[PDB]
Symmetry: C3
Subunit: 213 residues, 3 copies
């Protein structure tokens, strides 16, 4: 698994759900995280979609020692550099690029990049990768699609994201090739907006519970 | 926006519809264009799918000063060179390649290249682009799909093409991330074949009118 | 068609169906092939998905002189080297990569690589290719999809694979841009498992017969 401090495998096998977080106000990051954790969810993915995602990754790293925090929507080696220094323990990207793969392979934290087509998977596999966001899952054809896609690649394992809700997420967790999924429902904007971490903790717990049979 | 005489933004915001043109006979190009224009449609896209697309781009450039003419189905830097010298004001491609992006970034006119996956978008974004054909729109999953696809990229704007008719085109023009669409219905082969520009002018006007609320 | 001993065109036009083979036991390869052939099917595609695909390609090459044997799920130039030396007459891949294209273009046998998006097609077209697996066909949107995809590329011809059965395969063989298809139904695991080549021969014949009108 390269020059990486922890392996992409380990991030993706920590639990069934990785929350896809858009944090608008800096002061919410830390408690949000703890609520998440308190509710049994440890792999936090802060999307670089807000003005101060990095500040939030940075504080979650510093203050929530028990949470594995990483960065999503990482698009280029600069953003990768930036988030690695903020203290990101892994990165996720929506799709892959020769640079971003080159750079990630060179840096100190695992990157689980998004794919849609087999050509895409193959390119990332060329750089030694074996773990992938599959995104946008639903839109990409969902379950049936990913099974076709994983037909020729028995070694590779995914984490689907994009349109995954309580309603379909078990259909995904059911597949051989899926370790976990990413969704946005554990952190709704309006709960963040309103600091009601009571509610975040529970949406999380229910997500982790609802993930068995 | 690079070393480009006019910006990709400006082409795509000129109006709601960009006609996707397949011109078989050279003598039809010019009047076709004027009919188009007369019917309020100014961004002409001549597809390099006919034996004398370039001759047509060339004459439209020379004679229809009020029309913004460009080239579609541009596949490589050669064809890009060729159409730039014919007087093309922009190019569109069905999908993107490291070369074709490299070359376009180097030349004198904006290229709005087609994408389907986020990895594709990202590669073109690496070269500084922010405007994209999204193609083939329908087949690619259509509306729902493009919204997922544009989830992580709030800055980027599309122009969908591929299966877009009077029936669905407003569903697209409705999206935040869509400036305009491309369709083939304003220039039907049989109208071209038959020189009935009366009809082209009107299909165009109705397209531009039917694009509000 | 490059420095290739036989052209990609010729492989794909040999017949309508190319079987997609997963051979688990070495001793089955040869008779399987002959049954196939005996049933009028000559282009054999042994997928590099088993522990001894190469050994099987190798023996089919040596012993079934009348069968055109090739390798599927070829993912990198190494595997390409390997299978070329085993005696593979062509390769197929699930999707394409700059390396794998570079390397194939350099070697001695045609590679018909899988695509899903037009950007993908275009990249392979950059290296002079004109023949493509379209994969996974169904999941990729199927028929409608491939027609859109082949809209701008009248020269290119496909061989769809991925979800193709007796039920849909004529819908595909019907398209201008399709020379043939790939499916797994002519070689079912349990027939291989059980050496009942009686049955393989016939599933093949019926496939070739059922491919007319």
């Amino acid at each position: 698994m390269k020059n990486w401090k922890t392996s992409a495998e380990s991030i993706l096998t920590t639990g069934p759900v990785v929350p896809v977080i858009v944090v608008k106000k800096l002061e919410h990051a830390v408690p949000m995280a703890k609520a998440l954790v308190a509710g049994g969810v440890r792999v936090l993915n802060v999307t670089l979609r807000t003005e101060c995602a990095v500040d939030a990754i940075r504080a979650i790293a510093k203050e929530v020692p028990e949470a594995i925090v990483g960065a999503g929507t990482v698009l280029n080696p600069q953003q990768l550099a930036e988030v690695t220094e903020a203290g990101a323990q892994f990165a996720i990207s929506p799709g892959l690029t020769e640079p971003l793969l080159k750079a990630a392979t060179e840096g100190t934290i695992p990157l689980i990049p998004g794919i849609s087509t087999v050509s895409e998977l193959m390119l990332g596999m060329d750089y030694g990768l074996k773990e992938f966001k599959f995104f946008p899952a639903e839109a990409n054809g969902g379950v049936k699609a990913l099974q076709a896609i994983a037909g020729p690649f028995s070694q590779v394992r995914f984490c689907p994201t994009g349109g995954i809700s309580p309603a379909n997420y078990r259909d995904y967790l059911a597949l051989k090739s899926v370790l976990c999924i990413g969704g946005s429902w554990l952190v709704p904007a309006d709960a963040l907006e309103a600091g009601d971490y009571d509610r975040i903790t529970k949406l999380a717990r229910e997500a982790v519970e609802g993930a068995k049979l």
